[PDB]
Design a protein around this ligand. Structure first.
Ligand code: UK4
Length: 390
């Protein structure tokens, strides 16, 4: 199994709660002059009779606490009833030598750097592409409207991941000592974390639905449904931007009401998470069906003409490589390779690898459908010919 600082802090939470409960639930000694019990971010020492040490077993939240489960952290208090002071008047003396001791933290830090650079290339490419597709009035179709909505979806997704990773600065605090673990959990179980992480869940689902809209619109062009345009366009924008709210807010309400701690991370024994991951899988499967049907149409269309041995293969390969970015069909590979029962560091390493590869779908789309496009080059040439005369 894989453990990291995440699991250590999660165990520390339970240890602190348990020791804090036993701190008051423990009956006080009848005699006096005793040394006062406490919990000082490392272990919960009990009352100690004066003139001798206190022998607490090694805390069990430590990653190495199982190798030697008989070491004792040693502390001494004076026979007058005072914890022994260390030199230079610091925290009371305690002996720690008994129990004491690439990695997933560095791994996660590198996957994070590649993913931020990619989502930051995709953001730049798509903002320039949206500007170009909005500037010229000759590029106003309905398919271009769908493209602009898709680009807006990608930009919103890439802006949400930056807000999650710079709200909580986990990329500096991955080497935190004991005295900072309260400030991590305190921020975790707050409301700002919950809302910043629920916004990300909606911006991730809108992005899959605006790729189901692309697929369905292409299919309805090729399956000859020429229904009333205004009804069709309003229906498409609706299914794009407002269907997520049909499975996000039920999840966002059950998690709010029924959970006491945490920042809406996957629950241990329950399975509340299916309200978000079930429709995403549904949309991925449907878009895969649309992809295979459209390829089945294109292959016959180019088989109908007169072509050599290698030109059909070249054209089919080029068409497929052009269509995988728009319909997001690489997700079906990613959905199979992801374990949906892993929690913690295992889950955070599987998810970040997908996000490193699927972070530059937005640059790929913006370069395939706004820069190597024929008509955009044509419009640039037309505008430069006129500006030549002044
Ligand atoms: N308590 C606590 C604590 C413990 C350790 C550290 C620092 O060390 C370590 C070690 C391993 C991994 C990590 C980071 C790994 C990930 N991020 C934040 C984060 N991105 C997420 C994306 C998707 C999901 C998901 O479920 O889909 C959930 C996501 N989560 C976890 C929670 C959920 C909102 O944020 C949290 C930390 N950090 C600390 F900063 C805080």
């Amino acid at each position: 199994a894989t453990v990291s600082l995440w699991e250590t802090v999660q165990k520390w939470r339970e240890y602190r709660r348990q020791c804090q409960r036993s701190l008051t639930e423990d009956p006080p000694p009848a005699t006096d002059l005793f040394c006062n019990r406490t919990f000082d971010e490392y272990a919960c020492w009990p009352d100690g009779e004066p003139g001798s040490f206190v022998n607490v077993s090694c805390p069990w939240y430590l990653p190495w606490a199982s190798s030697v489960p008989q070491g004792h952290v040693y502390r001494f208090c004076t026979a007058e009833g005072l914890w022994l002071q260390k030199d230079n008047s610091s925290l009371p003396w305690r002996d720690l030598s008994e129990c004491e001791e690439s990695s997933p933290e560095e791994q996660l830090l590198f996957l994070y750097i590649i993913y931020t650079v990619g989502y930051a290339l995709s953001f730049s490419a798509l903002v320039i592409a949206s500007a170009i597709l909005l500037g010229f009035r000759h590029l106003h179709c309905t398919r271009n409207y769908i493209h602009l909505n898709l680009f807006a979806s990608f930009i919103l997704r890439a802006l949400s991941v930056f807000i999650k990773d710079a709200a909580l600065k986990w990329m500096y605090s991955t080497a935190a000592q004991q005295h900072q673990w309260d400030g991590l959990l305190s921020y975790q179980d707050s409301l700002s974390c919950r809302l910043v992480f629920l916004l990300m869940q909606y911006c991730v689902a809108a992005n899959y639905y605006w790729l189901l809209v692309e697929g369905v619109y292409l299919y309805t062009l090729l399956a000859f449904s020429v229904f009333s345009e205004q009804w069709i366009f309003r229906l498409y924008v609706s299914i794009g931007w407002g269907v997520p709210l049909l499975f996000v807010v039920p999840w966002g309400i059950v998690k709010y009401l029924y959970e006491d701690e945490g920042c809406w991370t996957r629950n241990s024994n329950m399975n509340y998470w299916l309200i978000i991951r079930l429709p995403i899988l549904f949309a991925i499967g449907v878009n895969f069906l649309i992809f295979v049907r459209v390829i089945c149409i294109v292959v016959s269309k180019l088989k109908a003409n007169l072509m050599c041995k290698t030109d059909i293969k070249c054209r089919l390969a080029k068409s497929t490589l052009t269509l995988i970015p728009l319909l997001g069909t690489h997700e079906v590979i990613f959905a199979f390779v992801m374990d949906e029962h892993a929690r913690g560091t295992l889950r955070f390493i599987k998810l970040f690898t997908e996000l490193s590869f699927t972070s530059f779908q937005g640059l790929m789309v913006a370069i395939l459908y706004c820069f190597v496009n024929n008509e955009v080059q044509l419009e640039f040439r037309k505008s430069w010919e006129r500006w030549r005369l002044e």
